[PDB]
Amino acid sequence: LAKLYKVSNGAGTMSVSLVADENPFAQGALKSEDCFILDHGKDGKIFVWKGKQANTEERKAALKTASDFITKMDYPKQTQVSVLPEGGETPLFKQFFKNWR
Numbered sequence: 411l412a413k414l415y416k417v418s419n420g421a422g423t424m425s426v427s428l429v430a431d432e433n434p435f436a437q438g439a440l441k442s443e444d445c446f447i448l449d450h451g452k453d454g455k456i457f458v459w460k461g462k463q464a465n466t467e468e469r470k471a472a473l474k475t476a477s478d479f480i481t482k483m484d485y486p487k488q489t490q491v492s493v494l495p496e497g498g499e500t501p502l503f504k505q506f507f508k509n510w511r
């Protein structure tokens with residue numbers, strides 16, 4: 411039910427693109443050069459994961475987009491985007507992935 415999106419300007423424009431809609435996700439889906447949005451907003455769980463090599467524009471776009479998802483998908487009004495750096499992932503985030511190590 412969760413979806414994972416890439417937020418990157420590496421392809422020439424700033425783009426939010428779906429990378430996973432089958433659960434659980436591959437840990438290797440998270441690429442250090444970009445940011446990712448993990449959307450499980452129906453229960454208020456939305457994450458921005460910031461790759462260590464992503465750029466400032468990607469971080470800002472990922473946070474803006476994750477915030478806009480709350481509004482546009484009618485997620486609960488008190489939902490807070492959880493922002494995590496590569497290497498600082500929490501159990502709540504890792505639970506979405508297969509065999510995180």
Ligand SMILES: [Ca+2]
Pocket residue numbers: 418419420443444445463464465468
């Ligand atoms: Ca990038």
